[PDB]
Amino acid sequence: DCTMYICGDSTECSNLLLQYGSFCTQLKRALTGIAVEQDKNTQEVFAQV
């Protein structure tokens, strides 16, 4: 979570962070892709019957 990690629940920090655009929409998507890949990896090996 960018908002909590970068900024200590401060409104001004969030207001300045919105100025950077989508630097976390990309960061929050790669981790979900990795999680989905990990979930598929364990199923591709054992679920064969």
Binding site: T3, M4, K28
Partner: protein
């Protein structure tokens, strides 16, 4: 709110990580040491 996050009007089936929830404060407290006497700043800035 999910539609707002996805910047679209039709969302397909699935599970999405939308936002975060936090608990707001109830009040504010202030704690200070017990001091009452005034500081002697007049001697420093008004010296013969």
């Amino acid at each position: 709110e999910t539609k707002c996050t996805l910047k679209s009007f039709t969302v397909e089936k699935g599970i999405y990580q939308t936002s975060n929830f936090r608990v707001q404060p109830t009040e504010s407290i202030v704690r200070f040491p017990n001091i009452t006497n005034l500081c002697p700043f007049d001697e420093v800035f008004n010296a013969t």
